[PDB]
Amino acid sequence: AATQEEIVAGLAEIVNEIAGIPVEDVKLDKSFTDDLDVDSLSMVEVVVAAEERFDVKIPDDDVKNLKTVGDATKYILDHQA
């Protein structure tokens, strides 16, 4: 279980590990594979550590359709426990 504050703010922690993007820069209007740029191939590893964080369940086949954390937020909320 998590909140938007865990998703948005929390992702930046994970994103800072995976790639090294600022711990507040992974905002709702910040697209992972566009504005953020998070290694690009390793992006699934962000998912893994995010799944670790929110306890979310998002397989590679599922995550392949995301964009920003705006999408990720309501998405992760429905895909988490």
Cβ(2)–Cβ(52) below 8 Å = no
Measured distance between the N- and C-terminal CA atoms of the chain, rounded to whole angstroms = 5
Give the separation between CA 1 and CA 18, rounded to whole angstroms. 22
68, β-bridge pairs? 31
Cβ(39)–Cβ(48) below 8 Å = no
Give the separation between CA 30 and CA 55, rounded to whole angstroms. 22
Give the separation between CA 40 and CA 55, rounded to whole angstroms. 23
Experimental approach was NMR
Cβ(19)–Cβ(32) below 8 Å = no
Give the separation between CA 81 and CA 23, rounded to whole angstroms. 24
Domain boundaries, the chain: 1-81
Q: Which helix (H) or strand (E) holds 41?
A: none
Q: Catalytic residue numbers?
A: 39
CATH fold label, 1-81: 1.10.1200
Cβ(73)–Cβ(7) below 8 Å = yes
